[PDB]
Amino acid sequence: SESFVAPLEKRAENDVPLGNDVPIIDLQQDHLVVVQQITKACQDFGLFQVINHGLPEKLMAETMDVCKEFFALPAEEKEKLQPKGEPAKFELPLEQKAKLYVEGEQAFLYWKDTLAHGCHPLDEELVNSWPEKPATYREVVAKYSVEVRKLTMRILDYICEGLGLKLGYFDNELSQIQMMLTNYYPPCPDPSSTLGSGGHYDGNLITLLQQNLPGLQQLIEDAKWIAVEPIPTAFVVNLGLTLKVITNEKFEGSIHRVVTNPTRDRVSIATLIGPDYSCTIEPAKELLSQDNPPLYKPYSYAEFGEIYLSDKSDYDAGVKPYKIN
Template sequence: MHYQFAKSSLSCQLKTKKNLFEKDEGLSDFEPSIDQRPKLYIEKEYTPNKNGSNTKNVKDAVFWKDTFGHGCHPLTQDVINSWPEKPQKYREVIGEYVLELRKLSLRILDLMCEGLGLEVGYLAQELSQTQLMVTHHYPQCPDPNSTIGIGEHCDGALLNLVQQELSGLHVRAKDGKWFGVEPIPGALVVINGLILKVVTNGKLSSGVHRVVTNSTSDRTSLGSLISPIECIIEPAKLLINESNPPLFKSFSYTEYLGYYFSDTTEIEAALKPYKL
């Protein structure tokens, strides 16, 4: 499941964030030193501080993207010091940006609680202990038919807020058809993760999505993923009754991540060991 959520007060910060990766101060100039690169390379979305390029083959396609990411909550000085020093003002701008994104994420989660009949704050406590900022850059591709930005998947997190200014994000409908999520100025795309599906006992589904490449322009997107650190994941007890038995058994978040990153045979393979 996905939504588009307009937040005009973020528009200036979003523009500033995007400008950091443009021609003058951006990805073309973002060249981490040799000492920085080991801690910045990214292989998996939940690695705290990593960066890299991905050209892994997926069936007959090749991933076509550059990615870097880092933790941003809890926002301690040690965390900020681990961020890149370049482009200039990166730490200042992103520090403000991620605080606003976290406030918005928690507000959205509280609205979900109200709609589900859960206590406000239920989703915004230990289920939301961490926040990871992931930036994907998809260079202009000479042959989009043979490449993919990101293959179809569900996020392993609780919630993901995505900022995009060019099309390329596709979401899969219940009938299996794909449709593009066109960017709306000043809006963020809200994508439910697998953890949200478990906690709501299937009342909220996780959003299956992918990213396609194009031959005309580069595309950069920013994702802010809200997740637990370590806790027991289970359906909320208020959503369980005789008419709505639990769909999942309780499990450790750390154990679940092991399945999420190791078993990619199916979209929701990480949840298979816990289904009832």
């Protein structure tokens, strides 16, 4: 279908090499070693994996199971999450009730269905707006949401120590939105022409990604793409464009994409943590000086969000209007 054909320059080459230099960070090393290894990965790559991360492996497996079970539901059930008979778009206002979403660039569509909902804070109103089926989705994903948030806040405090910010710097308005995106990539008859997910930064602060199958790729120097090895019991940590700005580019944001597969489907679980739409984003004043002048002026997260979700002329189109010095 023409609707899914990516522009020639954005098409993935067939043989992308494994990223052997993707850091795999054991969180059960000594505290300072973990801080140093995370700091180095954040400065150099903006993407790393965490293992022995304290989130139950059984819960990771049960969550991947119920997410796969959701995408196996019949059309009559999935229609209940399609407002006015079609998938929702990633556009503001981005509601926290569960919806199925379509995504692309303005023009082609990504070879992807995404279930998305808010996860924080957990109350009856929010969980009652989640999928009704499968029966155990709400029970399992409520537990998963809380555990992934706990691990994310641990990683943000490692990041604080690495940067020389006070512990809890991000335990406020900067992390108040937790969007869980369950991504379904069905088999594609022509992977040479399509993308599961176009190249992007995550616009938010930090993302934890759970995957068990290949398809995730990262952009490194000289327009080189590498493959991010799936470790089913690990989380991939992607630093967002918001953290790039707050660290005044001391940290890299992760530019990543997902390629399609001709033979098998793939489910990934992305937990996108970041600011409320009411937030003002700027480089952390604590880190600035005459030697480290701010590279961004303060901006509205809502204003950024509208650009980020619409303009894909460049990976950092969202923050281009706010660049200074």
